[PDB]
Design a protein around this ligand. Structure first.
Ligand code: PLP
Ligand code: PLP
Lengths: 396, 396
């Protein structure tokens, strides 16, 4: 029965891991997958996380199944982080949160939920966008359409093109927005633009779906969520797929959440019952460890203070590398101006390098980046900066 | 968009948790979901597991993403447990294993894989069977058909009916078998019957799919796998969805695996690439903690010895309760003979109680069992045995 199965195509991002594995060369530079690296080029476990894991080791008395929607505390802490401690959405009980295996897991649950329980047929994603977005929604039988977003020539957000692109979006359509730190551009809408988009969305009858995987990496926890909050203030219904993989450094523990918002508690509870049905037939219930670590940290003043500082330290080291990257490129004799990357938020730099240049960097210099020209700044260190830039300058 | 969504129907097994939650009554007896309880009526963390978690706390240096298929060591230890340390399948590299979020997660991955990459259209499950089996395969767009299995009158396996039921199964069809400790009957085929089924399967051209969630709870680790091994000795292709939720007491960490077997390594690697594609669009990569605990224990002589003993202790306590259950029923003046339950393996007892009797036990006595008459023996203790049996005797 498996005789004629075809070899699956490699994933443009996750597949870089395999190539890096095979590459036997010494000083390879991994600037692919978006994982944080410290000055040493290692991806350490946060101290706040180790302390939480210590706590769980001493106090956990059972591994009995969690409910289908996960740890209740995790859900509450997640909603406060997203909407604000005294949000009306929380007080009016208009939101329900399911703990999921990572933000990717949240996206799949949302997709299965939409495909089977609503009239939704199309999902609009930005151009360019995170490649797995199309893949996930397509697997659920939903078609994906793109809306203009990045201006490759001016390295900025083409708001006019965005609006015009979306005018082709019909009521009942889902429009996907990145909460902050747009992946891969790093360009986010200003608050004014978020507000304008919120109003337009309501009038056009779109169902907003936020992919929020980098809260805290743009400006701060609360600041990075003002766009989503602007939307939540005007919409009756919303869906948020969030992830703690990056802001907690819990990548492999698969910690995320899918939050559903409706007009009232009666409606959201009803809809949420179908989201739980979608989860039941997938993985049944979520993994406890990762989410337990997050809930423990967020609900403890001491641990929370330490975690917030570590998040601040991560954000600041990336910003340092970002400036050092541009300066070194100029220092090494860069062909063109790369100052526009200082304007991008998050772990990435949408460099503008062509597919061939990326291929050559890998082949001839052992420098690994995503074919789209996306480079992981968080993977840069004072030690690999020099050879990194010499290679780039060499392919311009 | 969520205005007209319908309330999802409650799950016959997982839904018992919610009801137990609402029930404010004092001495409720939970004999529903299949989770192990000790003499105290608690579901403790195994000692071997706590020691492993200790080890990980001290040695883990990163939470960086695992590969799509999980921890390689976990996969190897899983294959040895299933096929045998010196199995030809392992030596000829005919098997690939993906770490998944629980056995349920493995079933979903298998289903998505089959639905999109093969001509499979039907899956045959036993009557009766684990309710989520139909639900999971149906969600992937595959139809489920039932084959005779349990003889409600003689409380045994009706092998003749089984064979005749399956003669309606066409080549290319998937036939699902429980590795051991059939859920909910507790009745497994003898080795001779497994062998006969293996031969028939090959001749009819069926694709066997084993749900192996209770390895070690029938007779022992190796013994409980002889049925699967009989099949693996004659088939070119097989799929095994296994779980460590019960034999390791790791329920909420979601630890399972989906193992794919093909004629040769070239074919299995090709097919496996599509299984990874199916996982990529679901949860991306699996949760590390649970599987790390399992790999650590299985690859360490010391920890493995302790774990195997704990497994033995769990199996023996259930067997004790099983005999005490029958004796107490007779002692309390049971209507009919219940000795047939001594012949059932696993945590359950397929009692024969009707839907109304189960409803009444819950309503009037606070005793919770599954509507099918399935009762969790592992949930029985010397303390709740008396009131438990008095309630049952009262509804006969
Ligand atoms: C990291 C990320 C996610 C979710 O990642 P998980 O590892 O599955 O939690 C989703 N969308 C984007 C754009 C991301 O960068
Ligand atoms: C426990 C069980 C599973 C898998 O359970 P998980 O908790 O998802 O690992 C699958 N099939 C049967 C029949 C089971 O009893």
């Amino acid at each position: 029965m498996f005789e004629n199965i075809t070899t699956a195509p490699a994933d443009p991002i996750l597949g870089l891991a395999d190539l890096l594995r095979a590459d036997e060369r010494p000083g390879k530079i991994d600037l692919g997958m978006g994982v944080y690296n410290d000055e040493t080029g290692k991806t350490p476990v946060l101290t706040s996380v180790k302390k939480a894991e210590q706590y769980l080791l001493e106090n956990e008395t059972t591994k009995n199944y969690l409910g289908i929607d996960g740890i209740p505390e995790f859900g509450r802490c997640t909603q406060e982080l997203l909407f604000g401690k005294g949000s009306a959405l929380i007080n009016d009980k208009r939101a329900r949160t399911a703990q999921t295996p990572g933000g990717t897991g949240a996206l799949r649950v949302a997709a299965d939920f939409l495909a089977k329980n609503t009239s939704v047929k199309r999902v609009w994603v930005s151009n360019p966008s995170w490649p797995n977005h199309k893949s996930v929604f397509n697997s659920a039988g939903l078609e994906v359409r793109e809306y203009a977003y990045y201006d490759a020539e001016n390295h900025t957000l083409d708001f006019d093109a965005l609006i015009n692109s979306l005018n082709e979006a019909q009521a009942g359509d889902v429009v996907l927005f990145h909460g902050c730190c747009h992946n891969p551009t790093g360009i986010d809408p200003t608050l004014e633009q978020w507000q304008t988009l919120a109003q337009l969305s309501v009038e056009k009858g779109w169902l907003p779906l936020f992919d929020f995987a980098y809260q805290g990496f743009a400006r701060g926890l609360e600041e990075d969520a003002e766009g989503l909050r602007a939307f939540a203030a005007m919409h009756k219904e919303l869906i948020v797929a969030s992830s703690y993989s990056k802001n907690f450094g819990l990548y492999n523990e698969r910690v995320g959440a899918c939050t559903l918002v409706a007009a009232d508690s009666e409606t959201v509870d009803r809809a949420f019952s179908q989201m739980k049905a979608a989860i039941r037939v997938n993985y049944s219930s979520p993994p406890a460890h990762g989410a337990s670590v997050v809930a423990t940290i967020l609900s403890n003043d001491a641990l929370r203070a330490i975690w917030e500082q570590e998040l601040t330290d991560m954000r600041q080291r990336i910003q340092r590398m970002r400036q050092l990257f541009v300066n070194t490129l100029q220092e090494k004799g860069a062909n063109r101006d790369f100052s526009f990357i200082i304007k991008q938020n998050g772990m990435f730099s949408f460099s503008g390098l062509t597919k061939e240049q990326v291929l050559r960097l890998r082949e001839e210099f052992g420098v690994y980046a995503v074919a789209s020209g996306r480079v992981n700044v968080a993977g840069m260190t004072p030690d690999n900066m020099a050879p990194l830039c010499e290679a780039i300058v060499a392919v311009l």
